[model samples]
Target chain A: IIANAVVAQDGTGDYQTLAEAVAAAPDKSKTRYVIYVKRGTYKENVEVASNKMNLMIVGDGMYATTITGSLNVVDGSTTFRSATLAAVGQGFILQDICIQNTAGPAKDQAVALRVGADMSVINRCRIDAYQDTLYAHSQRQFYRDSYVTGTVDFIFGNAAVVFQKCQLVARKPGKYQQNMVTAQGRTDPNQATGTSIQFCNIIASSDLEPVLKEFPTYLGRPWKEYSRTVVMESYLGGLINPAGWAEWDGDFALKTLYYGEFMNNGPGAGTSKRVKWPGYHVITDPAKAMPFTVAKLIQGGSWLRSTGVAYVDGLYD
Target chain B: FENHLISEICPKTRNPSLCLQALESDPRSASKDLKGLGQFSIDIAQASAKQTSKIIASLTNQATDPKLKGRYETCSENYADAIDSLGQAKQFLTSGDYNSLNIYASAAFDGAGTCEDSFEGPPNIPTQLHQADLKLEDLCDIVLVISNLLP
Candidate 1:
């Protein structure tokens, strides 16, 4: 699909501002309305409301194009309202762009990119923030070959989401704070919502590398009672704590949260000292982690093929 | 002026004594209907959250421990959301959007719990801040319970 509108900082495009371009989109669009975002740093906050359906945003490159915001909880913004870029419409697509919330670790719950779109695809993008970053707010979403950096609960939400062959960077947090990579918020056992991270690199950033031992990182903690997350065939870095997962509280969701690790390899992947919570598991059966695969969990193969995006429908290896 | 209504509503909340005390102290609660009571509850929650924000700010400045200060900074953010959520709850009430009102009220409630949960354990978070967090949570709970009764 060709771009219906173009956003460029210079006067070379259809619109100079992203907000204007988004405002120009027709409501309830059935066909994809592509917005080709040119290379530049956009400092504005943007939202694709629920009615603006099937809007695809294409950027020149992840490094060359950026959408940045610093709105955070400390500044009176709710975590839900603090995203630099929020896509709530159905079938949304964003490619090769950087969406960042520059609010540091202390600001807390600042979201870089929030996707509440069903059948959404985010490819080759960069999401940078500290806590509560990359809110997979709801519905079927797929992220492939993307990069996300954060301190605590960096990738979180109650969404049926998948990350494939992506770089999940854990950044250094304030003293006394631990770096938690993902805090999936699946509230009900019946809810088809969980975070499936497959073929991803879960590693510490350069800044976090130096102080790795001082501030230990963990794979994730449950943000809700039935919070479910799976890390399969991913590279777990040495920065990760031996315990693997931290408790939300003393025993809050330890017995109910579904956390699993399958065929992960690294210094941090040893299950000897991993948390012994009844709900935390080391999956030996391939069938156990199969539900989290792209073809099954998000049903990505059905929707992602049309976008011409690269995604591994099954195990990487 | 119905003391019976106050008695009827407060029992439905998680923290009955706290709810009763808040509503009874406000003279306007005596004459308020169910929706008015919900609005007044949100008003109380907003005021409580504003105070909690101040407490968090004070702790942020007074804390010498990097860990303590960092947690307080996070609390500052949560209280800000709690305060704003209550404000949104009031707007939802005025607009007669009961479902959205419930959601915002729950956000306010979650904000307080999240702030308290940020700190690992005791002696890390001050008693003053803990008290404030619980109070704000209770107030938001009252708002939520009353919102359910808002037809």
Candidate 2:
């Protein structure tokens, strides 16, 4: 569907905003609704509901087609539960646009992108926020070649997400950075899903001082009793805590949680000094680490190849 | 000279003189004697238990691979068995049954080796306990000291 709604500071199209065009679109359709966002900073919060399946939102570029919002969970009467772009529809593909939550570091648990749908793909886009930034909730999803930045539990949730060739920029929270990333609330043992950052480059955000070598940043911590996550074959920057992982508290929930590293290279891949926890496994065998492939975990022999998206495992290899 | 100091410090020191004489006779024999009598059994047992716990925690905290969970759970059970054998050895030592102590200690040693071998490679000790605070080696040394005092 064409965007008849021209959202310009000066008066333009029949509808004033993008939301009005979405409201006017048909409820259900066999083909995909292609919403082409024009080159402008649209300061709006948009939600693509579940019925809007096969909804494709394309932007001019990351800079030109920007959807920005500054709502945060903290420092407001509203609960820290608002997203700049909330997509609940399955088969939603958002490309070339930038969805930003300008809530900054002060507000924790405020999400920038809240994705509550299955089989969603976010490609070549920029998702910016502080804490609780990207919430991939309750589904199997894939994010390719995107950039995500945050502090506490930034890229979190219960979704089985495979982030391929993405850039995970860690932002320092002042004198010391506490809990750089966390994947919480994964309670199922048989889910075969958790946060997987594969073949990504972890770098320090430019906001922090350049010479902050001892900056304490964790890979992730258990959000629930059985929270599971992994960073395999990724280029980890020196900003990572040498322990590689941290604990939420002195809770026994960590005893049963599943965490491991396989063939990870970089300055931060030192496993000799990792936490001596019973749950952390230093995977050395290539044969044992084979099942973590994108084809085995996320794609599972699907036709994602036809969509021009690179295979998740091939990106790392 | 150390023996003279011990004799002067305590006139009723029988085992100290014997231990000094044994040490002088063969330095390697002391380690061999300890190994044979299973003096290192409790140390291996405790290390196995702690290592097993550490591996489990690492697996639970950072592992994304599903296959490692089964390996971790299996090693955890092995460490629990080693702890049980070490406890029995401690009971034997308390009752002054050196023979039973030797048997239990040997069992504990074997159990610890099994636990360690269960993993693909060495366990990754947390850096906070080592590199951050310089307390990693300290913890391992203390475990050794405590194990020496067990019998």
Candidate 3:
């Protein structure tokens, strides 16, 4: 059954802002609250607190249901302070919403979206910003069929996140922009779950000449010393260099980090001639690569069926 | 200097006279000519195990920098060994000794690449020679190059 929370200008619903609806919902229980956002731009910051579980925010459309905020690192604010929507609640799911940061390209390290919640899912959402667009702060997150655009370290954080069948766009760094895309920040080997990108299309944000030389886009860097990340079975564009991974600073983390790729086909998948480092693995076995799927990861088996969002796994099938 | 000229002609005929003619014809061909001459010298002393050992000994003893001496010596010895193996393989090819040619060719290529690695630096060295920029293209390129060359 669907428990609906509708918010409009009339304020006839339980709350005006989405966060208020979530706040009024039951806590720490096995209940699914589907907050249906109507067609309008919501200029408000939202936080799904730790106690709220099984919360789903579905927008009418990504463009119409926009949640925007202005926060940035250069302003002396940490990444946590910049989030437009910070999700710390467990089993939180968002679909077809545009979570954005209005701080633009000038603001570095400003996070548009932050997900610290466990077993969360983001589908068909548009996450836009310049630096640190989507922060998978912690826990396991599954982002499917979404469009995430940013300039620097757009997709980053210390979490196990899987981006599947998504449109991964890389924007050009402005004169002030530092670097683009950092992921997988697990401090200890045991804690290092990793960020994996599978079956996605990586494209440039705008029309520009593709530089032939390889630079560090990163499967991931050591935000923590033992960071781990992998990309498998994705359509990599000409933008990717012949080499497929990069390092962070000049640290010894390169020796200790875990970076791998499997059956990645494109201009970038010439692994036979690729670097043969101990930390990076080119998986040739199909059986070995099968477990990287969302079904095997976030959805698994009964959890999807129980959540009433089983259709979320249809993209993988 | 042309592809056909270099491809068909055997290295055995790549003496100083031919190299000088090639160099005179095209100054840009000097490095290749020098490499060819070096390859030829390596070929002549290749067959005899004792001669190969003596050449390697001489090259190894030529390093001046004390810190770099051992590394340079090792790399030079490896280059000499690769050259000898390539020469032996070329002989085998001329005699239509396919089996011996295959074995020696494999050894020669492996040795050549390994010798190159010896000069390249240690295995532990990070793939990134310098720090990376924040651009996606630059960052991706760094990752791609490092991934390809690391292991």
Candidate 4:
């Protein structure tokens, strides 16, 4: 698939690396400027700065194309600056690529991909890391048919993100440590930031599947007082704790946080043992969950369909 | 007692009494140099943050008021990030990157302040977590003061 620029490990393409192609791309373009990445692992920290708008990066395949890094907070990097691949450019799109932070669970707060891009699209991609993997920092975003794996607070940040048909894997954490999948950071009540998991799979990794009882994991914990998240029409694996949601501290955010689960199935989806907090709800109303859908949550119909990515605008059967 | 290095440095911080107690708590501060004292301050900050996090978790478990519990959870998350910042500050101290050390130490300080601010300003009264925040913030203040003196 030839694009405006090609990044191949060999001399067959226009550029040998992603940085070269991104740097050479025209900024503020009305039309999309595509950068086609060939198969191979590129070990570099890549960034699409905010000025570069309407950029798309397509790869051969998820596993076939990888961008890997190991920068982490434990090694003198801050959580905000530790991403392997960061896209700050608005209208950014990524497809069929694997972005990973090789820093294992030992290295705390390593991020594979940090997307601060508004109206961005991530399709058929794999984001791999241990802690704080996907920093969905700010803005509205849509992810479809993607795979994200981590140990603690992996899928977190203050973005209004909707994940559709995505596979969220909870890897093993350190001894006696618990795994928390999401940590929505909505400090202000007015901030349009929340996480919606629709028609997805929340499961344990190969190493975590067998010993789930010994090492308990929860759906999420509130990173901020007004944090909000919803899981609807998803398959929750048995690894999830009965409480569903964990507390950040004693007596905090439990009243203000909004956590809803609607029509989900799996051993972990049973709401009988779920937390009795005033903010936690087992939704039976389709109208309540409608606002979280792709069309309403991110206004996907206006721009998302044009990207040619398959999505569910409303509730899935 | 007058020969104590912390006695001279602690007086320059926000809470001299708290700074003195935190530095002297390690027992190794009396015999350490300024650089070693800087490292010691970060260690104290990290320990304070860890203790604060543990307390917040316990509070979360026993909390009945949903709104108050949510605030505690935010504080807990803040302390957890503070611990990470303090840990990074330790590495910066060892590397003699005083500028980076100050930044990380200040972040630890900010984390504690943010936790307190979550309660919406002064006169919110002191809970156990409020006490924890004060100690953590004071330790981070000592750390920043010590790092600022290196250059």
Model 4: per-residue Cα lDDT at residue A238: 96
Q: For candidate 1, what is the DockQ-based docking class?
A: incorrect
Tens digit of lDDT per residue, candidate 3, span B14-47? 1334433432443443354323433332243243
Give the range of the ten consecutive residues with the poorest summed lDDT in model 4 chain A: A185-194
Q: Write the per-residue lDDT of candidate 1 for residues B50-80, one digit (tens) a residue.
A: 9888878877777677655666766876576
For candidate 2, lDDT tens digit of each residue in A217-277?
Answer: 7888876667777778888877778888888777656677878788788887788888878
lDDT of 2: 0.60
Residue range A1-317, candidate 4, lDDT tens digits = 34999999988999999999999999888989999999999999998976688999999899999999998866655565678998867789999999999988888889999886767999999999989999887667999999999989999876778999999999888888889999987654433458999999999999999899888889999987878999999999999999999999986899999999999999899999999999999999999999789877777877887798998889985
lDDT of 1 by residue, A1-317 (tens): 57899999889999998889999998988788989999999999998876788888889999999999999877656576678998867689999899999988889779999876668999999999999889886667899899999998999986678999899999889989998998987644534568999999999899999999888899999888988999999999999899999998889999989999999988788988999999999999998989889887777776788888888898666
Each candidate's DockQ: 0.04, 0.01, 0.01, 0.02
Report the C-alpha lDDT of model 4 over B1-151, residue by residue, as the tens digit: 5336776678778788888777667765557888888887787789878877888888779767655565665576557556766776788788886755664565466566656755763225247877888877677778877876786
Please tell me the interface RMSD, in Å, for model 3.
22.2
Model 1, stretches more than 4 Å misplaced?
Answer: B1-151
* lDDT scores of the candidates, listed in order: 0.83, 0.60, 0.58, 0.82
The segments of candidate 2 whose C-alpha lies over 4 angstroms from its true place after superposition are: A1-16, A76-80, A174-176, A209-214, A300-303, A313-316, B1-151
lDDT of 2 at B150: 34
Which regions of candidate 3 are displaced past 4 Å?
A1-3, A10-14, A176-179, A207-219, A272-276, A295-299, A308-317, B1-151
